[PDB]
Amino acid sequence: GTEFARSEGASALASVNPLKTTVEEALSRGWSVKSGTGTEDATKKEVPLGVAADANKLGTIALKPDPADGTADITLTFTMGGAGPKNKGKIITLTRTAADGLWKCTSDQDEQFIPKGCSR
Secondary structure, three states: OOOOHHHHHHHHHHHHOOHHHHHHHHHHOOOEEEOOOOOOEOOOOEEEOOOOOOOOOOOEEEEEOOOEOOOOOEEEEEEOOOOOOOOOOOEEEEEEOOOOOOEEEEEOOOHHHOOOOOEO
16 A cells, blocks of 8 residues: 555656667667667677667566568567556557557556556
8 A cells, every 4th residue: 555656656757767768769770679788789780779678677578489580570678577566567668560660568466556658
C-alpha cells in the first residue's frame, strides 16, 4: 500500500523514451542500432544505444531485433524486475513499426499506473 507504483512507471518510461531519438538518428544514416554501451563501429556500421541494460535499478532494458536495421519492427522493452509488488514483472513496450516509422507504447501494468501516452 505504500509502494511508489506511479513513480515507478514514470521512471521506467523515462529510461526508454529518449532511446527513440537514438534509434531514429542511426536509421537516418543507414546504420544499424545495437544494444548496450560502446563506440560506433564503422566497419559493420552499428551504433550502440549507449545505455547499460541495468542503468535503472527498477529493471532491465532490451532491444529486439539486435542489431536492428530499420527493415523490421523494432521493440524496446523495460521489464520491471526490480519494482515493488504492484509492478514487479510488468513490461513497458515501445514498438516502431517499419512500414510507417511510427512509434507506439503499450504496457501490461494495472491501468491506473500506466504512464501518459501508453495504452494496454
